Symmetry: C3
Subunit: 494 residues, 3 copies
Amino acid sequence: LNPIVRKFQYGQHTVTLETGMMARQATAAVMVSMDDTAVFVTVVGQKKAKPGQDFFPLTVNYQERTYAAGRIPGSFFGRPSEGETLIARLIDRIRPLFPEGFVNEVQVIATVVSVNPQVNPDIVAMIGASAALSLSGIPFNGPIGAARVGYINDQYVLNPTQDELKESKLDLVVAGTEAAVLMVESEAELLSEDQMLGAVVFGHEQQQVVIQNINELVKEAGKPRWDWQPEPVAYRITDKQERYAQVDVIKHAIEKNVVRSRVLAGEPRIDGREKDMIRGLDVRTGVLPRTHGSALFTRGETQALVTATLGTARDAQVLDELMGERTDTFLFHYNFPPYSVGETGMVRREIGHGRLAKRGVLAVMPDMDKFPYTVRVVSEITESNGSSSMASVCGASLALMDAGVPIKAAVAGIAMGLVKEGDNYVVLSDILGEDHLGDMDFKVAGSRDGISALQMDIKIEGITKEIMQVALNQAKGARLHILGVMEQAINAPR
Amino acid sequence: LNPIVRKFQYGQHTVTLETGMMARQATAAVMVSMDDTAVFVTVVGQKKAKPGQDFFPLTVNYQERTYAAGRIPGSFFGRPSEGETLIARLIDRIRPLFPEGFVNEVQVIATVVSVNPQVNPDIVAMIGASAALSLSGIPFNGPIGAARVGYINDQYVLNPTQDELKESKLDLVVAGTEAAVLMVESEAELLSEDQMLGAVVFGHEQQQVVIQNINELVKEAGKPRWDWQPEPVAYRITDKQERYAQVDVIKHAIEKNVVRSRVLAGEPRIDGREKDMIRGLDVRTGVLPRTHGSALFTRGETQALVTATLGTARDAQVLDELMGERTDTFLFHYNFPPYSVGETGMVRREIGHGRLAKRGVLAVMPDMDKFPYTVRVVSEITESNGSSSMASVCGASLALMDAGVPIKAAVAGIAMGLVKEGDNYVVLSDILGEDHLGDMDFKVAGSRDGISALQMDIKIEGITKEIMQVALNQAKGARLHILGVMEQAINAPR
Amino acid sequence: LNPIVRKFQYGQHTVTLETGMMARQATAAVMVSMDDTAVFVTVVGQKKAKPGQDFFPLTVNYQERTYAAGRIPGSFFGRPSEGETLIARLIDRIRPLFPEGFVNEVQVIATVVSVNPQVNPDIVAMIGASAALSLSGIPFNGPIGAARVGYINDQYVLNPTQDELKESKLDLVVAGTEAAVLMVESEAELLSEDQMLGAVVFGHEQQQVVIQNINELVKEAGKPRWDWQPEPVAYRITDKQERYAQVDVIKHAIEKNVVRSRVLAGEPRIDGREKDMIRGLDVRTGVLPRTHGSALFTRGETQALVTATLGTARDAQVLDELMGERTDTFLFHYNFPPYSVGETGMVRREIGHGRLAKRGVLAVMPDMDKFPYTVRVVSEITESNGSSSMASVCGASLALMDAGVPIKAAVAGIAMGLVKEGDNYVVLSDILGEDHLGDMDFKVAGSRDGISALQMDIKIEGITKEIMQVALNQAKGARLHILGVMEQAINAPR
């Protein structure tokens, strides 16, 4: 047996890339260690695809073994936990790098086998997944880097530890290729637009050492490239329920292109709006009798019914996590029933949308010194047509004020889209479920003073920081418009 | 946004019907509030049915949110609970109102969003489901009413509260249309046949105010009616295992009609019995060595092996329910394995049959003052050919006496069927799995003195109370015959 | 109703065979009681098989009812437990007795309905399953006997009780027909090869009274035999990943026969080895930073990453089992991911392989007097190509020594195969995943002095004890070769 080991300095720590010894039957297997935090990541891609497979099947499995921290599992935790699904989501969000037409089934399995309580295994697993896909031979336009950005003493900190974080005003996670940023997931204490954008650029520049070191391992121990080639080559309908039913022609690529051009040229959108227009808002407070705090927020065809519950300090959820024991005082829940889009089925991505809406509200939540009560917020999505997660942020803010929770300020969220081909681009405000037919979509949540949460999902090459500068500026004026309408129905708690 | 609100007095309380504001993407969504008990009920019916769908797909989902009582969920309760499935069953049992030939997939989702501890959300959810289906436009021959009937001081009480119930001798739930009763589910402290029938008629008369007020909301805010039209138009085999195997012709509507007429005319049934004849009974006691209390009850081709277990007061199941904390001292379990009907599969309706058999025994169970021990009863269905739930009632009574539990009296159950077309009708005693091919089926469980449980399922228009008067009278003499045979093998506890 | 009862003396106890009274709708149902330990076993075989069914579907369901011990189930235990799946596996391992070409779906359901704390229901369930299949009429070349063999005071004890076991040096379970042994599952305190083989022969001779008494019940109350007749009638590829991919011809019985003859004649195996050659070994210790005890064991194309965890006496798993309360101080876990064989899927037989590897290590584990700490061992199968369970035994031994656990000696495991047709036979050492294409496969785990675990799976008629004598002797020299290589990398704990 022969192990190929390559080491490098990523920020403060030393990252070890190991392959060729363990799990050889898989397409590629990489042992990535970052100061004693080791995550074993594997990748398997099937040679022949199922004849007439309509979509690209990608599954990312992230699992935390408790023996990594030197502890024996308890009578309690088959099914993955809430946190494990979120980190598997952070990895998956590598998906748009597979070439268009690639339909082979591919599974990425990342297991935490050793852990340091100060080094978060989520970045380690993302580096391992990037190394596995690049060494595999499977058509993949990487490798990507993985970076966590902090903000201590008005300066950006690369990969802050759990102790450093406590002093940080930002918990940003950024992933992207050598050319452009692809994934961003941020949590912030009401920071400005430039401070959030500065962290995205900073993290993308610092993660370049990860991409270079994987590329060298690829040239040294990488398997040959796959023998795969791609196969050679409703206007006035505003209501989503009425549009989708009459669009079912007996007889997708043309459906994108027609909407694409009718926004690039600069004419009315699908529903009939200008590029920076927000849908009709309906705000209601105190809608359910026998609850503490309740709120109904409606934005065009997207609606969320949100509630708040006050409990004692003993009602706090004690989460036994791998990194350490953690007591959660603020709880957030997200429900997405099939009737929200007019469908029948099982009573998705609820964990991802729930945490995103939680991060948009967490920054404005009061201290345990001023408010020593366990607060739980549940969002019920009654209607969905564009970003029900940001509607939960608005609904939570009104529900907390209805309950009597003295939050620092009012908080709102907004979804933004972007269409680009040449030098000309258009940033759209309050996008419809427009989301599929685009280049990038990003959600900004924050108060009147700053930003609490920022999520980005880019799929196009060559987005400049000047284009994102303008994109966040329109997003700022978008949420200020929502907060102005919110400020009228409910302004103060109790 | 525009909410349409209609209020009315249902009994003691005020019922609010609200629609047109929440969940507009669904076919219909109704917010029903009864004195601070609010259940949000939605309905979605697909426009086009799956080509060549053989059965009518109906799914009722009832869920209780804990924030309704102003409480935060605990580390414990995806899957619905035992009580939530039973209430979803109470709603579902609306099914025979969809026109014959309607095969479109339709899902009804009812969620308890606000709750008053004195007003049971189960009746509230049934009113909401009746309002949703009527406002939807989906072919549905309603609306139905929902009523709970109590019996305090020899007088019928409409919708008794949780405190009133404690003084009631009856917990009856009745649902039906403006013309006839459709669903009954009763629990009683050994009441007479006329007292049980009087409650069914009383509840059907009182629930008429619900039907009228939904109908007015339908005329005001109801969506247009659906553009749907229906498509235009083994004798001596007594053994069920031998009949079903040889009936599989290579080559259902004719199979019903042939049995229908051969009972309407007045000739021997499928197995060869008269209309009021009970199958062969086999009663055995003390059949398992290392149990407390054990009993084997056989009725023709239906068999149940039942056991009893004695435990301390600490072994009682503490059920944290939405309405309040509840300690259960009498436990009942029901098992329906695939071999009971000669099939292979997963190791259905066990919760419904388990509670029905529990309600048939609960009335005869001794007090905690005379018997302060936690008693658990488990029924194992070894054979099934007609009503294994009533066989569990007989089996439980013998198992309790074998264990040494001093029950008030012996208790037995019987399933009854009815075939009707003109003025001539025939009520059948101890029906075979005859159940599918009929108009109504009802199960009566009780002692020699009174009735402990009464369940009804009607699917035909125009059943008079005089026909039910005769039907319950034959059911009385049926269980007295079973109790006479039971009284011989086991007569006294200890 | 008429029950047919036959009783006989099996060893110390009295075994009751009862049929014809309970569950008549099933193909056959038997009530088997062994001194108050009663297990109700049913069998259902469908008459017509699904047109073009490619494999034989057999499902064994073993379930333990808690009312059997006279106890009421607690708020805790749908899904079967760890122990229930293992006993269902002990029954299933009857499978090779169904004639070749029999493809009908058949389910065997065994339920423990009464239990004596001194008589293990696992042997009782195996007798019941043998009686059910023989009385059914379903083509089945039985009946089989079921025997547990102990070793107290240098003498073999038939069916030792739970108290006797404590004094036994062996916990062997043996099942087979009147002609030959079929299934063996052993746990031993470092016993010699002849002592283990002597127990297999002893148990097969003692279980003959079970086969004879079932056969008499078959002649008395057995259903007629089924009207079923059978339908009338890559050399140098060493790498498993390279062989399986290029073997997929467009165009199994010939694939077996070609390998069969090329081993019977006496020429190089599929990978190119002699009959008694072991694959290349790679042993590594201390491979994961932030664990207690860690080990990587590689054997050709089979690899296992194993870890050990040290905890306090309070961290011990308290297993509330049917026979009694049991505290487990040594924990073993087994993981089989899809990438171990180069596949994509859900993240099988892990419980069976986990317990087999546990039994191979349990004998060498130190006492609670010398080492009063809870030890947990987890095996991660990174590569699989022949017997990843025995690779876990080797990996566990090195991981315990790395953790500092003072185990009595070093322990290793080896998988063995056998090919036979005439008087000439060949026993193979360290078989590849060769396992499907054979007559019997057996795994021997033990130290330098004795044997800790012995599992056998025979599918052929006429294996003499002299052939097994030679087979275990080659297995002895096989594990001594592995222990010699292991003894070099890691020799002492701490």
